[PDB]
Scaffold this active site. Sequence first.
Site, PDB file in Angstrom:
ATOM      1  N   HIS A  26      17.556  15.130  48.272  1.00 37.78           N
ATOM      2  CA  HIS A  26      16.747  15.872  47.315  1.00 37.78           C
ATOM      3  C   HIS A  26      16.299  14.945  46.198  1.00 37.78           C
ATOM      4  O   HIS A  26      17.088  14.621  45.291  1.00 37.78           O
ATOM      5  CB  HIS A  26      17.551  17.028  46.732  1.00 37.78           C
ATOM      6  N   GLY A 155      17.439  28.176  40.713  1.00 35.42           N
ATOM      7  CA  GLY A 155      18.286  28.834  41.689  1.00 35.42           C
ATOM      8  C   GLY A 155      19.592  29.342  41.104  1.00 35.42           C
ATOM      9  O   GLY A 155      20.024  30.468  41.374  1.00 35.42           O
ATOM     10  N   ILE A 186       9.475  25.561  40.209  1.00 36.54           N
ATOM     11  CA  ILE A 186       9.406  25.333  41.652  1.00 36.54           C
ATOM     12  C   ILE A 186      10.777  25.621  42.243  1.00 36.54           C
ATOM     13  O   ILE A 186      11.796  25.206  41.684  1.00 36.54           O
ATOM     14  CB  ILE A 186       8.973  23.879  41.970  1.00 36.54           C
ATOM     15  N   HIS A 260      11.093  18.862  46.573  1.00 35.81           N
ATOM     16  CA  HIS A 260      12.420  19.387  46.284  1.00 35.81           C
ATOM     17  C   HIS A 260      13.489  18.743  47.160  1.00 35.81           C
ATOM     18  O   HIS A 260      14.555  18.363  46.658  1.00 35.81           O
ATOM     19  CB  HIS A 260      12.421  20.921  46.464  1.00 35.81           C
ATOM     20  N   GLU A 414      33.863  39.946  39.144  1.00 33.67           N
ATOM     21  CA  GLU A 414      34.830  39.242  39.986  1.00 33.67           C
ATOM     22  C   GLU A 414      34.362  37.842  40.350  1.00 33.67           C
ATOM     23  O   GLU A 414      35.156  36.898  40.367  1.00 33.67           O
ATOM     24  CB  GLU A 414      35.165  40.000  41.273  1.00 33.67           C
ATOM     25  N   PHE A 441      37.885  43.787  46.445  1.00 28.45           N
ATOM     26  CA  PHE A 441      36.812  43.237  45.643  1.00 28.45           C
ATOM     27  C   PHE A 441      36.991  41.753  45.331  1.00 28.45           C
ATOM     28  O   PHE A 441      36.072  41.155  44.756  1.00 28.45           O
ATOM     29  CB  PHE A 441      36.519  44.098  44.408  1.00 28.45           C
ATOM     30  N   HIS A 465      46.416  46.760  45.164  1.00 24.10           N
ATOM     31  CA  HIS A 465      45.839  47.869  45.935  1.00 24.10           C
ATOM     32  C   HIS A 465      45.373  47.341  47.296  1.00 24.10           C
ATOM     33  O   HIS A 465      44.223  47.475  47.720  1.00 24.10           O
ATOM     34  CB  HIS A 465      44.757  48.590  45.131  1.00 24.10           C
ATOM     35  N   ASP A 473      41.136  56.660  46.894  1.00 23.27           N
ATOM     36  CA  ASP A 473      39.845  56.016  46.682  1.00 23.27           C
ATOM     37  C   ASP A 473      39.113  55.766  47.998  1.00 23.27           C
ATOM     38  O   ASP A 473      37.879  55.670  47.985  1.00 23.27           O
ATOM     39  CB  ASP A 473      39.976  54.719  45.870  1.00 23.27           C
ATOM     40  N   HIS A 477      37.301  51.088  49.291  1.00 25.34           N
ATOM     41  CA  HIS A 477      38.266  50.350  48.490  1.00 25.34           C
ATOM     42  C   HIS A 477      39.385  49.725  49.312  1.00 25.34           C
ATOM     43  O   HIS A 477      40.146  48.920  48.777  1.00 25.34           O
ATOM     44  CB  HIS A 477      38.867  51.267  47.418  1.00 25.34           C
TER      45      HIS A 477
HETATM   46  C1  8FL Z   1      36.412  48.400  37.363  1.00 25.39           C
HETATM   47  C2  8FL Z   1      36.201  49.785  37.931  1.00 25.39           C
HETATM   48  C3  8FL Z   1      35.701  50.843  37.259  1.00 25.39           C
HETATM   49  C4  8FL Z   1      35.285  50.907  35.847  1.00 25.39           C
HETATM   50  C5  8FL Z   1      33.822  51.176  35.751  1.00 25.39           C
HETATM   51  O1  8FL Z   1      33.478  51.328  34.337  1.00 25.39           O
HETATM   52  P1  8FL Z   1      32.142  52.174  34.112  1.00 25.39           P
HETATM   53  O2  8FL Z   1      31.696  51.931  32.759  1.00 25.39           O
HETATM   54  O3  8FL Z   1      31.214  51.797  35.188  1.00 25.39           O
HETATM   55  O4  8FL Z   1      32.653  53.651  34.292  1.00 25.39           O
HETATM   56  P2  8FL Z   1      32.913  54.887  33.367  1.00 25.39           P
HETATM   57  O5  8FL Z   1      34.345  54.428  32.832  1.00 25.39           O
HETATM   58  O6  8FL Z   1      33.130  56.066  34.106  1.00 25.39           O
HETATM   59  O7  8FL Z   1      32.076  54.887  32.179  1.00 25.39           O
HETATM   60  S1  8FL Z   1      35.589  52.288  38.232  1.00 25.39           S
HETATM   61  C6  8FL Z   1      36.593  51.506  39.454  1.00 25.39           C
HETATM   62  O8  8FL Z   1      35.731  51.480  40.536  1.00 25.39           O
HETATM   63  N1  8FL Z   1      36.519  50.079  39.208  1.00 25.39           N
HETATM   64  C7  8FL Z   1      37.028  49.097  40.185  1.00 25.39           C
HETATM   65  C8  8FL Z   1      35.967  48.287  40.812  1.00 25.39           C
HETATM   66  C9  8FL Z   1      35.916  46.936  40.615  1.00 25.39           C
HETATM   67  N2  8FL Z   1      34.965  46.168  41.221  1.00 25.39           N
HETATM   68  C10 8FL Z   1      34.054  46.722  42.049  1.00 25.39           C
HETATM   69  C11 8FL Z   1      33.091  45.846  42.697  1.00 25.39           C
HETATM   70  N3  8FL Z   1      34.013  48.036  42.259  1.00 25.39           N
HETATM   71  C12 8FL Z   1      34.969  48.828  41.688  1.00 25.39           C
HETATM   72  N4  8FL Z   1      34.918  50.119  41.954  1.00 25.39           N
HETATM   73  C1  8FL Z   2      17.855  28.027  47.863  1.00 26.80           C
HETATM   74  C2  8FL Z   2      18.326  26.603  47.680  1.00 26.80           C
HETATM   75  C3  8FL Z   2      17.792  25.702  46.828  1.00 26.80           C
HETATM   76  C4  8FL Z   2      16.639  25.876  45.929  1.00 26.80           C
HETATM   77  C5  8FL Z   2      17.072  25.762  44.506  1.00 26.80           C
HETATM   78  O1  8FL Z   2      15.881  25.843  43.660  1.00 26.80           O
HETATM   79  P1  8FL Z   2      16.093  25.168  42.227  1.00 26.80           P
HETATM   80  O2  8FL Z   2      15.034  25.639  41.364  1.00 26.80           O
HETATM   81  O3  8FL Z   2      17.468  25.476  41.811  1.00 26.80           O
HETATM   82  O4  8FL Z   2      15.928  23.638  42.558  1.00 26.80           O
HETATM   83  P2  8FL Z   2      14.860  22.525  42.293  1.00 26.80           P
HETATM   84  O5  8FL Z   2      13.875  22.916  43.486  1.00 26.80           O
HETATM   85  O6  8FL Z   2      15.349  21.238  42.594  1.00 26.80           O
HETATM   86  O7  8FL Z   2      14.076  22.770  41.093  1.00 26.80           O
HETATM   87  S1  8FL Z   2      18.595  24.152  46.873  1.00 26.80           S
HETATM   88  C6  8FL Z   2      19.422  24.657  48.348  1.00 26.80           C
HETATM   89  O8  8FL Z   2      20.744  24.613  47.945  1.00 26.80           O
HETATM   90  N1  8FL Z   2      19.358  26.105  48.391  1.00 26.80           N
HETATM   91  C7  8FL Z   2      20.162  26.888  49.349  1.00 26.80           C
HETATM   92  C8  8FL Z   2      21.214  27.699  48.708  1.00 26.80           C
HETATM   93  C9  8FL Z   2      21.180  29.063  48.779  1.00 26.80           C
HETATM   94  N2  8FL Z   2      22.167  29.826  48.227  1.00 26.80           N
HETATM   95  C10 8FL Z   2      23.219  29.251  47.606  1.00 26.80           C
HETATM   96  C11 8FL Z   2      24.260  30.114  47.073  1.00 26.80           C
HETATM   97  N3  8FL Z   2      23.303  27.929  47.460  1.00 26.80           N
HETATM   98  C12 8FL Z   2      22.344  27.138  48.027  1.00 26.80           C
HETATM   99  N4  8FL Z   2      22.486  25.833  47.895  1.00 26.80           N
HETATM  100 CA    CA Z   3      13.368  24.731  40.163  1.00 21.82          CA
END
Ligand code: 8FL
Ligand code: 8FL
Ligand code: CA
Lengths: 676, 676
Positions: A26, A155, A186, A260, A414, A441, A465, A473, A477
């Site tokens: 690159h 990217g 680009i 690129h 996460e 998760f 869990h 759940d 989950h």
């Molecule tokens: C953190 C979490 C929650 C709080 C939401 O907080 P939010 O503001 O969205 O809900 P409110 O409290 O009702 O206002 S729910 C439970 O799912 N969970 C675990 C949870 C974690 N990660 C993913 C990907 N999905 C989930 N489901």
């Molecule tokens: C799409 C992609 C690229 C373009 C970047 O476009 P960006 O603007 O960041 O790069 P520039 O063109 O040099 O300006 S690189 C190649 O890795 N890739 C595949 C690619 C896709 N997904 C993940 C998670 N990692 C990667 N690596």
């Molecule tokens: Ca770029």
Amino acid sequence: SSVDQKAISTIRLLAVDAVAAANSGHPGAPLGLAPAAHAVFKKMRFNPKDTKWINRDRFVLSNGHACALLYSMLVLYGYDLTVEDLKKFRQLGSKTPGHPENTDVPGAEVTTGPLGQGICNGVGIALAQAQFAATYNKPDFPISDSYTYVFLGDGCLMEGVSSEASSLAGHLQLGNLIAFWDDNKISIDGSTEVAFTEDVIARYKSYGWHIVEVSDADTDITAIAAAIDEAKKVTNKPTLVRLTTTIGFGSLAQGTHGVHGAPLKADDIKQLKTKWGFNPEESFAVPAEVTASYNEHVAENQKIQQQWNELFAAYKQKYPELGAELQRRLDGKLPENWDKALPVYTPADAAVATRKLSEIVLSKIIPEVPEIIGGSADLTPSNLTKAKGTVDFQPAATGLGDYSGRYIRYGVREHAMGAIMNGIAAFGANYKNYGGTFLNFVSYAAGAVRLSALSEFPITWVATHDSIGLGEDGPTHQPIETLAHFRATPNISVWRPADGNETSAAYKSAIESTHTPHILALTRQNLPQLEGSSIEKASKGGYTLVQQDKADIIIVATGSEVSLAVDALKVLEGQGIKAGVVSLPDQLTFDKQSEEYKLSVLPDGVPILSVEVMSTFGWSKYSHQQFGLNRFGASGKAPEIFKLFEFTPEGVAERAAKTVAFYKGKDVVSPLRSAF
Amino acid sequence: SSVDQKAISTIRLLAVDAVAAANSGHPGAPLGLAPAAHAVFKKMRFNPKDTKWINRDRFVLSNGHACALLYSMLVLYGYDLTVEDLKKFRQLGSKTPGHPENTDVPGAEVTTGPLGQGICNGVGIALAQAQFAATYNKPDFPISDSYTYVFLGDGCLMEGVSSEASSLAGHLQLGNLIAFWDDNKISIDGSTEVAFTEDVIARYKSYGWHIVEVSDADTDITAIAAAIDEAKKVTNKPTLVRLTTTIGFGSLAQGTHGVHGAPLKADDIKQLKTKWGFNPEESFAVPAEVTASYNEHVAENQKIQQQWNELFAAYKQKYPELGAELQRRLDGKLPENWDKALPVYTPADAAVATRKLSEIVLSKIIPEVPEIIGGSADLTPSNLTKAKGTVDFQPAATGLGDYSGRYIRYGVREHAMGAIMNGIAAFGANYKNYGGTFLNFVSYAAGAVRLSALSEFPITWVATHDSIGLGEDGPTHQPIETLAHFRATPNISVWRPADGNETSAAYKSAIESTHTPHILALTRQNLPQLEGSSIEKASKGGYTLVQQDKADIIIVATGSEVSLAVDALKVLEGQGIKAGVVSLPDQLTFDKQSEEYKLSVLPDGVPILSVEVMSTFGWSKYSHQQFGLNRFGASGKAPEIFKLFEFTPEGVAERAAKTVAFYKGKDVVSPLRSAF
Ligand SMILES: CC1=C(CCOP(=O)(O)OP(=O)(O)O)S[C@@H](O)N1Cc1cnc(C)nc1N
Ligand SMILES: CC1=C(CCOP(=O)(O)OP(=O)(O)O)S[C@@H](O)N1Cc1cnc(C)nc1N
Ligand SMILES: [Ca+2]
Ligand SMILES: [Ca+2]
């Protein structure tokens, strides 16, 4: 300066020549980012002869495909990487792989290439630096005052993980983080107009970042240096520096997607060289005046480190206990006998969920091991990841914590949590850091988890869990595939402890780790303390829990299913079948034991049945027949789900009896045997 | 109105009572969002007796933990869900699982609960609606003019996947998307001040969304309705409606994290009922005046659908060809004999990479099957996912495409691409949609991929650069664990075609699918056309490529390793060993064949060796010994990597000979046999 212009040209041409020699890689972003790289490295404090100096500034190339740029900087500054290594860019076995790897490349802090990861790693390096400085700095003793510099591209800015980490970094007021966006308009699919038209700057302001814009980053190194100075004055916000560049600057093909990701044409390289005063017949040129200029900066940085070493010696006299703690951490050693704090259980003790056993472990070891910090992705009261009485890691300005705090509120993030954990580990100083979520998760963070394994970072997921045992759940989950996925990844220790002693063994492994990430799969539901468990035996990864010299079958199980196997053994006894039980809390640790030890656990001459309430993948390494769950779960009270799927003493016994019958008249050898 | 207030109270109390009966679930967000749910459903066009009406407005609950709210709405409106089902909330086997599942719950468009997914699914429903309307609408014939309404919370807004999809939706000017943020300032870890202090509204403006703020969404249904009207006037931007609510509104515990995720106390429920004019001794009350009010809206909506059916009949007369195409799609049928367009190859044809074979397939079938649309995550020239001559899906205002276009520029957004694909499938109308990335980065989208499987959506990943065969990009890009992960997930067809005929079979499966997502693992590098392959045989998922009646061993392989196995057979012949070859392009399809068919491929009485240049997990289902790659890869020219790891004809032959020797004197039965 004339020498600065020559240095920038040298960097550009080394990168182009490396890509040319490999006929792969690159050239575009290296050409566009050479001025910024020159300017940033001139501001950075580092020692090419001591890559682990704890007060160095860190650099992260999040747009890791641009690594010919990084390698050129490292070579020019006299790291343990040479022009001869650049000539071997992208060649099997070289020190210059096609994306940077921290295990292989001196001066690569992290492993990048998967987009979005490096900026998040930079957030973690900066988080660690703030926590470390808050822990150790004293009046007249700036033990830690370093910056974290990150380059990223479009990217990385499109990948959601970077949004997560940038939101959190803004919240955390991480003023020693300075990121630089390569604003070249680009990507692989062409103009960013086709897919990426958001107002990036407005978004970063919404996160609480400071912004500096450099409109001509193809040439204006004065403005790039000034942007760094400006960022350093803003101590309560991370800074994004917009570098408006031309991808492939100088190439005939500059400003196009074609620059690129493929080598330049030979005639293009010739015109680059003559435009910049280089010999078009020469490759890998390193003008001696560039080496001299860069050497002067190295020598200055080495005098800074020399003075830091004297500061550290004076700190050890003024602050004897903190100084000894800091020295121990910089030596990579845990406190002597720290593991005496691990809780130990007997079979007379009450049943406890392994998430609660984990809370208890953390409660005991956090006060004993200062380099443990961690958090949860908005699941603190569910994962049970915070020790009572600790303070959260927050800027003191919020009133919600302090940078000396131990507990991180990651929010529902996460993937960024996983990549931030990698950055905390990358900081060094023996940090042993952890992150909680539900096991199902952890999968949201797979991009980062895989990199923990490839990077050899001792991070820990507190993944509660773990199964249908969570109950109501329901199937969105309940893990099925998750442990198979991570066990199939090289270099991941996937602990699924059955009881109190096994949970302590899992933490002993996770905290002692120096090169292997851990996932601790923990229960919602209570499990009994097992007759026959101990930290000693569980530390072997797999062990004989119930030995039966005349076994008709051995049942191998993990986690919540070990107690199930023990109950099934009793049912089997009433059917005239004698079973042994093996507990296999970590397959990776077990695999690393001696062949003789492993065969003592899984001997020849007896059928072996595995039991684990998730995918059967992998289990044939250890068993002849597998009782698992290869369909999605269900929403209901957990005991009813176990009954539905026949994960009951009688259901296990039935399958064990069928296994004994299936092998009648057959010669059985250990699953550990193989043809090659 | 008085009846509107009574309806809102009814919704709140049904949700609370459902949580109470289960002694499990989430009362907080249902209490806070009942006014908004009432207002939105009153604006929506839907038929509870025809959940598949193609011009219905769609609703998505992205904060899926709040599903007691959704179920209450569905019950009140007379969907195929009753109060008796609400009484069985979270109970094993019920129609009211703890998170909504589209396969189980009438009126659940998608499966939510994993945070962030539903908003992205809504982006995909809206993308599909725009594409569908552009394809079919004519003057005086608004065949498709429906809206997509999404509820989301703070957790969805923290998850990076939602940022990806929101950036893209803003770029795509999706004016029929109307999302509502439950701005209640509470998550599981407490106040959003601890982790989520960004200016959400400013961020959404930066994506190009329109904003409406409702400051008192606990009571102001007039303002919520007005916000919908305002959103409908903004035809070139998706809209975010900020609903400032009190979590758990009305509870003694309102405004606290404790109301998020556990049942209310009994005395709290009593005071809710009396404050709102309900009998505190009664549960699951449905006042008849609420039923009457909701029934009047249903009856009006049914008259709207009646008129739409007449519009559709008139459309079929005015536009005979488009009308027949639309009818066929609404019947769920592909064009008659569409598969005659699939390319067929012979062993005399040239070697071709399976990514290029995929391009050729797409080129042939896209013109024949209008319901195919798809895109790539910034890898269009690498994945080879765009058919020459097609137009991109873009708003015409950009000049870069049109909503009638077929090809989506997802940008570097794998996770959102996966969840958007789920939404396109959820729209219906027989859409068969696909998304390209490198196989190793499908892992970034695991959260969505798993939901494709659980939701039974026929989406397709075009997952190129499948192995160490990609070469120089190195181990950060080279899959090891990836196919094991997805094969271990229930209901994922993971095709790894070896040649041209197998690639056509993989697409036949992917496009004909109605309930199973597909991942097509495709090569960077060229592979030969195989003697013995055909679409017919490859359609069985596994088949005997080379039959050897006196086989000493059978080699089972996939993808790039089938040709390797065929070459190894020749080496083995010179060593006096006769081998057969099995090609296993999709393990799931193979598993679904008859037991007798499967045993004809993997018979008793002969050792079987698997060969695939990635994890050995899963392979013991089909083999006695496994030759795979269980370590990370390397950066170098691909043939050199294969040689390093002994994936050569001689290396395979050596392991085959060792396998034959290992089973000398042993009785061998098919890997397909099992004890239970
Ligand atoms: C953190 C979490 C929650 C709080 C939401 O907080 P939010 O503001 O969205 O809900 P409110 O409290 O009702 O206002 S729910 C439970 O799912 N969970 C675990 C949870 C974690 N990660 C993913 C990907 N999905 C989930 N489901
Ligand atoms: C799409 C992609 C690229 C373009 C970047 O476009 P960006 O603007 O960041 O790069 P520039 O063109 O040099 O300006 S690189 C190649 O890795 N890739 C595949 C690619 C896709 N997904 C993940 C998670 N990692 C990667 N690596
Ligand atoms: Ca770029
Ligand atoms: Ca909330």
